[PDB]
Amino acid sequence: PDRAELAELVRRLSVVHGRVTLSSGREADYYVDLRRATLHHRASALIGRLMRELTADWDYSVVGGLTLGADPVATAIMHAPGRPIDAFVVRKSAKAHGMQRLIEGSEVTGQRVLVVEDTSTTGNSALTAVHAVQDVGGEVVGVATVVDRATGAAEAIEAEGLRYRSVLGLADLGL
Amino acid sequence: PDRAELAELVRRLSVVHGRVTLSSGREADYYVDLRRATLHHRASALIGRLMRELTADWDYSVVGGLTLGADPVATAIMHAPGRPIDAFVVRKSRLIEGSEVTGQRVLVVEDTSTTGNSALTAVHAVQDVGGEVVGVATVVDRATGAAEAIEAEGLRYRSVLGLADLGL
């Protein structure tokens, strides 16, 4: 029921129907804004729960990713029922202070880390977080995401020796 | 107990004592890394509870502020028990992500700040889109005029913690 409850909320909240002229001059009939679910009271509590179950067999104390598409997901996982898991956010530029200048939040040095994102087209953003955690001495145990969009992300993440899992898929969006 | 236990988590996770050089060149005897608290599993859960208690007499359906500092606070409030409250995020540079703020009563959040400019930016961004801001709540007030700046704009300001809870 949860996967289906979430899947429906993602469709309703995040598939934004309506015609739009892009900067290129092409028109699209819809676009996919996952931030609308990841920041919704109900969809986020489901995301938290389901991403915990999805990764239950992985060994990690810390969850995080690349701002902003990761923050709400990571915090959802942190707040969801179960064993303690802390969070972190990889920035795009360097903090003024500390010994992990691209990483807000919890100390990832010497921890096993889950890397998350709401959705990835290329896996660029996820891998940017993976390497940022890596450069500071964190063990990335895998990457997980709310929605796979079958656009190359899995094979890009798998190419660097890392597991990839998703709660939802292209079919769950309708389209 | 909740407030006392958060205070202790904020001292232990976020108040970094020792001679330090700021980005300006100024030397301080400490700095505050409030995000280690806002991204910690226990402290964030207390933040959501306590920020909800703190603003229980205000009417708002949506909570959020300027990225990154606000997002961990906004989602802790959203995930905390009680009546449903959605979240939003004001970007620095399409300004508002997440839940709709237009036509809604909105709580602007900040983890902490010396000047309140970040809070103000979020307030202004919500106003430009037809949201009504009911006030600003923060985790830590630094007693450096943030409050009064927010009050000059006709907005109520509140904090869970203050300067004295940070043992300086």
Residue numbers in the entry:
A (entry chain A): 4 to 178
B (entry chain B): 4 to 96, 104 to 178
From the study:
The fifth step in the de novo biosynthetic pathway is catalyzed by the enzyme orotate phosphoribosyltransfrase that synthesises orotidine 5′-monophosphate (OMP) and pyrophosphate from α-D-5-phosphoribosyl-1-pyrophosphate (PRPP) and orotate (OA). Herein, we report the X-ray crystal structures of MtOPRT (coded by the rv0382c gene) in complex with PRPP, inorganic phosphate and an exogenous Fe(III) dicitrate molecule (ferric dicitrate, FDC) at 2.25 Å, 1.90 Å and 2.40 Å resolution, respectively. In all the structures herein described, both monomers composing the functional homodimeric unit are related by a 2-fold axis, with a solvent excluded surface between monomers of 1045 Å2 (13% of each subunit surface).
The inspection of the catalytic sites of the protein crystallized in absence of ligands revealed a bulky residual density located in the substrate-binding pocket I of one monomer of each of the two functional dimers present in the asymmetric unit. Given the predominant nature of the mononuclear dicitrate species at physiological conditions and the presence of iron(III) and citrate species in the crystallisation solution of ligand-free MtOPRT, we manually fitted the FDC molecule in the electron density with satisfactory results both in terms of ligand geometry and refinement statistics. FDC is held in place by hydrogen bonds involving the non-conserved Ala99 (3.5 Å, long range H-bond). These interactions contribute to the stabilisation of the “flexible loop” of the neighbouring chain.
